[PDB]
Amino acid sequence: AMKILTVNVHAWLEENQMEKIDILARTIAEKQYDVIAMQEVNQLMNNKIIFDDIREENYAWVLLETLQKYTDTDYYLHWSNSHIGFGKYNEGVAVITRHKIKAEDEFYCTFAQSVRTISARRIVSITINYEGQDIEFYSCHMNLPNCETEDMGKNIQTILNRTQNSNLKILMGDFNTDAIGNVAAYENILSQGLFDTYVMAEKKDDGITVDKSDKAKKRLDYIFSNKELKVKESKVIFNNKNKEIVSDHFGIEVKIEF
Numbered sequence: 001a002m003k004i005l006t007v008n009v010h011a012w013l014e015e016n017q018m019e020k021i022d023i024l025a026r027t028i029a030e031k032q033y034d035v036i037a038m039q040e041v042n043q044l045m046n047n048k049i050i051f052d053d054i055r056e057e058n059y060a061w062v063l064l065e066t067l068q069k070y071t072d073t074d075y076y077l078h079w080s081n082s083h084i085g086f087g088k089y090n091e092g093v094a095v096i097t098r099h100k101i102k103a104e105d106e107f108y109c110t111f112a113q114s115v116r117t118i119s120a121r122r123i124v125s126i127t128i129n130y131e132g133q134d135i136e137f138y139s140c141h142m143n144l145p146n147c148e149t150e151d152m153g154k155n156i157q158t159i160l161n162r163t164q165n166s167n168l169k170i171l172m173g174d175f176n177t178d179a180i181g182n183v184a185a186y187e188n189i190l191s192q193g194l195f196d197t198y199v200m201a202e203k204k205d206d207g208i209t210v211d212k213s214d215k216a217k218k219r220l221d222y223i224f225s226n227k228e229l230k231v232k233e234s235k236v237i238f239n240n241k242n243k244e245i246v247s248d249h250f251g252i253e254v255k256i257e258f
C-alpha cells in the first residue's frame with residue numbers, strides 16, 4: 001500500500017500564498033504521502049543559496065519547513081531548475097519523499113536545454129527500494145502538444161530511456177494535454193508504452209484537474225506507469241471539494257498496492 005500525490009503548485013504566483021502553502025503542508029501531514037511530485041516550483045534568482053542549487057524561499061523548501069510544523073516524519077527534497085520563469089524566478093520541478101533513495105537524476109527531457117528558453121524542461125527522478133523492488137518516480141512538466149519545436153513523443157522517449165532496466169517507472173505531472181479535448185495527443189502519450197492510473201483505478205471521480213469558472217473543464221495532469229498496476233483509487237484533491245484550492249491546477253492523489 002502506497003499513496004502518491006502530484007500537484008502543479010504555481011509557486012509564488014498565487015494570491016493568498018502563505019495560507020495555500022499551509023493547506024498543502026497540513027494535508028501532506030495528515031495523509032503521510034510516500035511521494036509528492038511538484039511542478040512550477042519557483043525560487044528567486046537573486047536570493048542566496050541555502051545549499052546545492054536551492055535558494056532561500058524556494059517554494060518546495062518552504063513547504064518542507066512548514067511540513068515540519070505538523071509532522072515528525074522526515075521528508076526529503078529533490079529539486080531541479082528548468083529555465084528562467086515568470087518575473088525573476090527559476091522554474092523547476094521537485095519531489096518530496098518519506099523514503100530514503102538509491103538514485104537521483106536531474107536532466108532535460110527536451111531538445112531545448114537553455115535556461116533562456118521557456119520550452120527547456122528538466123525532469124527530476126528518484127529511485128526508491130520498496131518491498132524488494134526498485135521503483136523510479138519522475139516529476140514532469142511538459143510543453144503543449146502542438147508546440148512547434150518539441151516533439152512530445154520524443155521527449156517522453158527520453159524520460160523512459162534515461163535508465164536502461166526493467167524497473168517500474170512512475171511518471172507524474174503536468175502534461176498540458178486534455179484527455180477529453182485533445183484525444184489524439186493523449187492517445188499519443190500512451191503509444192509511448194504508458195498506462196494511465198486514472199483509467200486503471202478501481203474507484204475514481206470525474207478526474208478534472210483544471211477548472212476555469214463543461215466548456216472549460218480539463219484533465220491536464222496525470223500519473224502514468226510503464227507497467228500495469230493494481231490501482232485502488234484515483235481522486236482529485238485541492239478543488240474546494242476534497243480540500244481547499246492551493247494552485248491554479250488541482251492535484252491528483254493515487255493509491256497503489258504491490
Ligand SMILES: [Mg+2]
Pocket residue numbers: 008010040248
Ligand atoms: Mg501554470
